[PDB]
Design a protein around this ligand. Sequence first.
Ligand code: DCS
Ligand code: DCS
Lengths: 370, 370
Amino acid sequence: VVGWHRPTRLHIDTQAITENVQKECQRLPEGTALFAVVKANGYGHGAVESAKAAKKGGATGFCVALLDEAIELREAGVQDPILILSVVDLAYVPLLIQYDLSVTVATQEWLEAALQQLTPESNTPLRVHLKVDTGMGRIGFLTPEETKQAVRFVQSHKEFLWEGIFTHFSTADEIDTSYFEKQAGRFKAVLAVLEELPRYVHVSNSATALWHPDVPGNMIRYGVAMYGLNPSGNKLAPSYALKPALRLTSELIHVKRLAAGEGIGYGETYVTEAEEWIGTVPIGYADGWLRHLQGFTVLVNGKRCEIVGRVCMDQCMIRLAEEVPVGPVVTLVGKDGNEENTLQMVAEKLETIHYEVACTFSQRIPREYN
Amino acid sequence: VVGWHRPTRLHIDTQAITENVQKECQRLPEGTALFAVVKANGYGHGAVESAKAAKKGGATGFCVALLDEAIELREAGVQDPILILSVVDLAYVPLLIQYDLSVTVATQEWLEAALQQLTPESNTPLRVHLKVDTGMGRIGFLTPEETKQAVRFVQSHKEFLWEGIFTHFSTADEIDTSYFEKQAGRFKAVLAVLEELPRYVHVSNSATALWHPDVPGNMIRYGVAMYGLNPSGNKLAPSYALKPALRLTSELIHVKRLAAGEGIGYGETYVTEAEEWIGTVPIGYADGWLRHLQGFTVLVNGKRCEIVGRVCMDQCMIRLAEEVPVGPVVTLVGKDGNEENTLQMVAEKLETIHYEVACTFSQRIPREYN
Ligand SMILES: Cc1ncc(COP(=O)(O)O)c(CNC2CONC2=O)c1O
Ligand SMILES: Cc1ncc(COP(=O)(O)O)c(CNC2CONC2=O)c1O
């Protein structure tokens, strides 16, 4: 299940994770907390290690997207608050108590149904965070009144404890700020009809924390920035230099001299124009190195090489500058000489964002930590 | 790392894999063997349970890409021949002997090197397969004399065994048979200088087996077709009814009505043209439901539902043409009523081949079998 017996490898610089986190904490008021969102296996970097690295930088809470992803954190030994970011089935409400997990709620219907199968006055309250939809449009309460009604209800039952209320931004990372503020208005107006306020009032994410610090709240969910990736993609400049924590390498496992007019790859989409030194790298699209990456250039001995021909499930072919033996290290993501390949670079070639590139990296790729 | 606590599931139909394998086995010259390639964790369907399904279907051997994948097969109780299709780093020759695995060899250098670490009378010969490149240009011996040299060497030292020779086609699923014929030619030459052949002489794949059933050989490496997927996308009609084995479902976890003029998802790339019902499904690009699936329509109660707004890491919102509570089954790949979502459709919307959609589905998605 994990390709340990193949030179293809992912190196993760956890120190970066800590640095990126520390620096952000230094820009936060003494009252603002920093929760490290490590869902989807730390954006493909590794949950536990990201969490562990995250903590050492000031992290005092973590966010995940699944119940069992949290259990893994609990199991891994993290004893800090863990916030599951999306809705969770009622059948699994007991698991939330057993692991003292914090859950997000978006319907009055959920709470009422949860209220049942919950002891009258449990010695273990259910930590709820109310999600308000102020523009994202995926989950949350749409109305200040509903929001408020939700609160009144959670407040009127000791079997609950709402440690939070929050919302999420859909365009924090954009130059035009108009929609952003409209979302903030919707949040203010829904907090506005509230008497009390929980311990956690969060609204910002990586993008928000960087280009909209003034935004209210005593807690922030730091994501991609943790891994040193500009949230805006390329649109704006982070408030501080982010250190990249993802590195991907492999090596040549076959070298060859091809005559002119030899086709390489499926459907022979490529044909030699002349004498060409072609290298065979053991990484395919099943590893995450997608087919549309064809044409992209990777690194070897500090020189760029083009991926020629169709990328395969388990390998691909690159045009080597000059003869070379089997064994030279192939840098796909990272620095090598003067050349460097950023996930942003991979992303732009893939016409997506690095959030996706990173997750797409299969488990078949062993990850090594500094 | 597996989200069993999230209704997003990947249903696999083993019976179908068996049936796809039997169909071909009966269609086969019966003086031929069927090897089932189950790399990339069974093409996303699950290696061990796919293999076993192919066995009871008539398979008598297995192809994988990594030594690791191979050992899994051994530890699982598979006692049939297991051939590793790519080169395997010299450092693991002893494991090869340990798990009596067959290995691919595409150079003379390697062979004379493996010989070093091989004991004259180890009573365990190194079962090798000599891959000759004829077309497709990834690995293998380029010329006849080169293979003649490789062969005469292997038959010599007798720590080896030489189980077979084979090549791989790059255009077998193409309507135009030119390039194919060429590769077949070059492979005829290769075998033409060897006054002898091994147990296995294979060149056939999914594609070649279906549309070029007469090409020379006594064993085929059946891949994608044993999973029910047209090995050519939609260019050619298979030679027999392939039955899809993969299926993907999830379910509505959030439902709301929005008023005309509301934005959904990141960036605000979508706004309600009027009042409408929006559903939220717990599956995102971290699962392998890539961002470019927007506009694609999934199935709810046999009715099509368009994915609106950007696909999130962990979820996506769809436009429900009705009014429905939470819980109805969301069908992303498979049937519902008279509607059908097939991997091909997914591949076409993604602008690639289903081979990749299947291998991209993440580990986190639980795979249910029968
Ligand atoms: C509710 C919520 N808060 C915070 C975050 C952290 O965001 P950043 O990484 O941008 O700081 C996310 C992840 N949201 C994303 C990002 O990509 N796909 C998603 O579902 C989230 O869903
Ligand atoms: C040498 C070899 N034989 C047989 C197969 C099985 O092919 P089918 O699935 O098409 O029947 C493959 C997989 N080759 C692919 C397919 O995609 N990427 C690869 O490296 C292969 O590499």
